[model samples]
Target: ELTVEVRGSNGAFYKGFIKDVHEDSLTVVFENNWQPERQVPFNEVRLPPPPEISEGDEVEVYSRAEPCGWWLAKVRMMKGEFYVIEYATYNEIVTFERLRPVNQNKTV
Candidate 1:
């Protein structure tokens, strides 16, 4: 387990442990917090989820829960949905044909 501080562009921040890691990004669950019967809406700080992330690289982002957190560095890999990397915040299925090594190398 590791502890890091992530600063988001929006404004919110997060201090917690890396809960899960996929091909790209890691999911860090805040140390504290609670939720009632209703689902708590944690704001995402990063806009347009990161291009690609590493396994354990610290990073900062802004979208909508914990909304704006920046870590030490960038994640090792990235955030996407593929053969093994099955946990993406967006895009459940990725069309491989639509993405070729050369063509898909836009951002990440």
Candidate 2:
């Protein structure tokens, strides 16, 4: 399974896993609230880069809250393009686009 970020024509984006790739579009299953399926054009999706990620790598992950900020977490598992993350207070499974490298050099 591949993790994909689907960019809508209105510029909104959502996180999902790739279910199938067709010649002109992709079938994606979005996280959380699901209509169970969506089809987005290939040009509207972004795939994760190669080399993937490893356990123990620190990352910033998406939080389902107002303002939708990201939080610091450590990678606990890699399942296809999805990751199981250990956040400050909980663990969550999310797509790659929901994760960004932890900026080690940045100071709070």
Q: What lDDT tens digits, residue by residue, belong to model 1 across residues 1-46?
A: 4543333343334445444555555555553531211111233312
TM-score of 1: 0.27
- The C-alpha TM-scores of every prediction are 0.27, 0.45
Deviation (Å) of 14 in candidate 1: 2.0
Model 2: lDDT of residue 37: 73
In candidate 2, how many Å is residue 90 off?
0.6
Q: What are the per-residue Cα lDDT tens digits for candidate 2 across 4-107?
A: 66554434345577888788878887766345677767676765434445767988676653224346689988888778888736888888788878533321
lDDT of 1 at 13: 45
How much lDDT does candidate 1 score? 0.33
